[PDB]
């Protein structure tokens, strides 16, 4: 058995979940030296078709490096681990778990942002909307949707109000159910 | 004859059939306005106990004053009172909840009735044998055909009693799904033991044919619902010119999917749903906006009036359709459906919570088990049982009637304070926003990427394949109302914009 | 038995009654979209000849392939196919046209059918006597009961064939009024001669009782229509809370005025109108704006589908309900209803034009006389005549059928080019304005002053008394939706503002 | 027989219509000397209840005089005489008839106007609307209706466009049927 307990504490998975994820890791490595880079992710058949493919591929990575090791795939993936009520209310000392609802929204705001400057902006919303929506739809119509969202969301007055009210408009959206994944053993 | 007024003569023999029906519908409407107008009554009573009370009150006035109360029949029900309620439920369907909560809704129904049915069958067999002369002689199959008719929660009563409480959308969709998908395994445990009653020796191959029968009754039911859904979508493509026939292609194309699938003896209750979820995407798009506010605001009236009528009818058919009281059997079926329901729920939630994301908090389990109401599909199915094949239906009706009354009154007037005492989450999602919608689709695409990165093929990946499929091959050969390519962002923006503009213009001062 | 698939079995004995009906309604819908889609057909044919052609085509396919075509019955008609069409006509009623053109509409109906009925009676009596053995032996009363069933223009066919031509609003309201008010003197010349058939010696007092019968059948019919109109207005007062039962208080309160007035053997066709003109002022006000766009856009669909169905049914009941051809009688009834209609029209317009404001230009007279179509109330009334009391109904049906076909085809495919050739004014009033409305009410008040200055008590003075009455004593005890005092100026402004705002918001780009 | 033929030509009535109108004239005179004044009209039971009562009473009169003679009641009343097609298309020489459609609208514009200056104005529309409508309804709401009508009607640009387009928006309204009265013999 390899070293997996420290990952099990840092992430919060069980043991078989980590084993299965490492199995997929070995399958998708296509070479030990290139454990995970941008090229390895881009050639996955379906996510590239997904509009948010490049954002996700550039979203796992901590910094400008183009390597991902297995432990990191686990650090960046745990953010989806389903929140467990008893095991989160058992001991309340600090926000150790990487799947706390705060982090499940910080992940979204980090996907929106161009760089990690905590700045959602009309440029950012317009870019992501033109990603999700096709290219045929009217551009200043996209601007209308984006600026309507900006106006209704921003209580900061700078049109940004990047995170604090981001949570406030998302609280009506149950993210515990929405953005979490059960990784089969 | 008729010296005075030669023409004027009473012809109550051709109008009586529609005039009595119009009077009954008027009684439904007047009671519905009545117990909304009277203050504070909506809290104490579940507004659906009073419908049964009025039903039996007018059944005790119609009777006792020399007129047999009309026993809500069985097939003026499967065809005329149920399809509106089922189409309402399956049209305004919160589809995202099914798509995420599909495992539980398809396992609290397929193997959550196929269990209670057999649980009641077994234990009521036991009580019948050791009961006494009158209860005895029912025999197993005449008890399995009671378990399968009493343990079929009503897609009517559950919704009509859970509309007012506004339970958490997850719990509400769980009772939705239980009831809507229940009939797929009630109409294969009611037409199967009837043919397993007179079929002298059962064998074991016939049970395998029973399983294949269930697969057919479910899958073919949904498939017929789809086939008259890709035709009420393909026919509302061509109706740009003919604007006054829009509110009809949704009805005679589902109420002809509910009759071409109750014909074959498939499950109509679920084929109607499957034809109410393949039409809305492609009939909300290419018809106009006033025809749609007609379809929606008419289906709501249909279902409200139909639920009121069939509760008044369980009321008026318990004064002339309940008799032959047998204490041991009645008390046994009460205890052995309640204890059956709660035990099945506890077991299956222990099973599920090893798989789902948001675990079923014991509040959820108790409001599921305690909130699974029995309704008119337990009465109108205990009334199709002929008195010649099964010589014990003097008693099945009174057991069914006491169970309907127990799960509509004491599980109806008490589910109201029960959620308050247990402090369950109550409808956080009252209103709607735009940022909600945009970020929701963002998170959906995020997970659709992540799950395929991992390899965990799940709900999001299938939603992805289905949505790409009916964004390439369908929605260009089925909508053709210039909306062949407009994503849900744009459509939702237009809907919200139209709504707020209408409200602003109404607020003239 | 049923070795394979134990449950799956064909149950076509309970669903057949609703399944055949659903198929017929689907055929109506598909044909309606079909001859709108196919180009240029709407010009050549009156879009209601093709409905009869398809009716008889599918009646010749149902027959000849071993199945008796369903003879559109009589009382699946008076009660189920007619009330939608009549309520549509009497709900969307251009009331100002009736209020000004009331003399002609009440004299082209009361003494414009009571004349054609007797004209056909007399002259077809004459032809029958001198006809031959087969035609002979009908006798006067068996011919008056043919005049009175053939000379009753259909509130269905006239509207269904004059919808497409868009005739001058005056001429269109004249045919509206003729047909809607005709039944008040068809159902007192059909239930009166039937009782004047077996009533051995007529006497003369019985005819006086006949006149009093007509006064009752008309006035009491309108009065019952009003009484269930001041109750569907008083019940939509209380429905602020219950928003999902609005589209129903308009139907079960008029379709229960059409059955509590067809019960007594009053005229339902006009009681339904009178209950469709006392509800709209007090049910357009206090219910919401989406329930109203439901009522309106559903009544339109009702009537469109019902007219299509009964034309398909006159089509499918002429392949199995027309027989016993007799040349002298058929040709005689054609000529002697056409010559009767035009002569009655010429006479009564000479009478009227000595009283009305805008004289009936001979274009008006010819499009009235030539455009009075016969429809299913001539067929479904020639089918209630039992073959035992009247032993000549083998022939009455074929005469009625040839007359229906003549006034629906040759007075249907030709009324289209006829108005073009005569160059009659065609629907100048397509659109609507605000200045129109304001100045119209100004002129109305001007005349209401002038007529009382002169002493000429007329239409405007009665409108004044009625409007002051239901602005003081009613509309404060009947609307109570905060709109107890808002004049029609304000309501019209809000309606137009809402409409233009909705259209602007729809035009996003 | 009194002198009635010149009235019959000037107005356009028949003879019995004039006789019946003179009968009503004698009934409502309440005194020979006061043939018709403002006081005589105001005490008619119903028109005073009508919002346009005072406008009509001041509308018959030619000028500031407060007498009306019978011949004038006929001149000012003929304006409602129904237009007769054959008798108007028989001879076309001049607009002699007092019930020609032009005069049937000039009567309206003369009812609107404060003084005979041919000037419909927001003051005039607001006054007449507050007459027809009750006093309870909102005042700047009446202004909204009035100015909406002004804007849609006025192609003159001065907000007035008093008569020429007045006819143009009324042509869609059949006034031949609308504003005419059959005076029973
Ligand atoms: C015969 C009637 C008593 C009936 C009973 C059960 C079913 C059924 O298969 N599924 C339901 N009801 N949900 C259909 C019918 S039917 C074809 O309408 O007459
Ligand atoms: C019996 C049926 C044949 C019938 C015939 C005539 C009438 C009538 O009085 N007026 C009409 N139809 N316009 C009513 C009916 S009924 C009471 O619906 O069965």
Author numbering:
A (entry chain D), D (entry chain C): 11 to 195
B (entry chain B), C (entry chain A): 85 to 593
Any passages from the paper?
To investigate how a pharmacological competitive antagonist blocks NHE1 activity, we included an NHE1 selective inhibitor, cariporide, during protein expression, purification and grid preparation, and also replaced Na+ with non-transportable K+ while maintaining pH at 7.532. The cariporide molecule was resolved only in the 3.5-Å map, and thus this complex model is termed NHE1-CHP1K/cariporide. Three cytoplasmic helices, HC1 (residues 518−538), HC2 (residues 543−562), and HC3 (residues 570−590) were determined in the NHE1-CHP1K/cariporide complex structure. Strikingly, in the context of the NHE1-CHP1K/cariporide complex, distal ends of the two CHP1 subunits move close to each other and towards the membrane plane, as evidenced by observations that the height of the E-helix of the fourth EF hand (E4th helix) of CHP1 relative to the membrane is reduced by 11 Å and that the end-to-end distance between E4th helices becomes 23-Å shorter than that in the NHE1-CHP1Na/6.5 complex. Consequently, both HC1 and CHP1 become nearly parallel to the membrane plane and thus the angle between HC1 and HC2 helices reduces from 88° to 63°. Cariporide bound from the extracellular side to a negatively charged pocket in each NHE1 subunit. This pocket is located in between the dimerization domain and core domain, ~10-Å in depth, and surrounded by a bundle of helices, namely TMs 3, 6, 8, 9, and 12. D267TM6 directly interacts with the positively charged guanidine group of cariporide. This structural observation indicates that the cariporide-bound complex is stabilized in the outward-facing state. Interestingly, the CHP1 molecule favors a well-defined conformation in the outward-facing NHE1-CHP1K/cariporide complex, in sharp contrast with the high heterogeneity of CHP1 conformations observed in the inward-facing state.
Sodium/proton exchanger 1 (NHE1) is an electroneutral secondary active transporter present on the plasma membrane of most mammalian cells and plays critical roles in regulating intracellular pH and volume homeostasis. Calcineurin B-homologous protein 1 (CHP1) is an obligate binding partner that promotes NHE1 biosynthetic maturation, cell surface expression and pH-sensitivity. We find that NHE1 assembles as a symmetrical homodimer, with each subunit undergoing an elevator-like conformational change during cation exchange. Each monomer is made up of a dimerization domain (TMs 1−3 and 7−10) and a core domain (TMs 4−6 and 11−13).
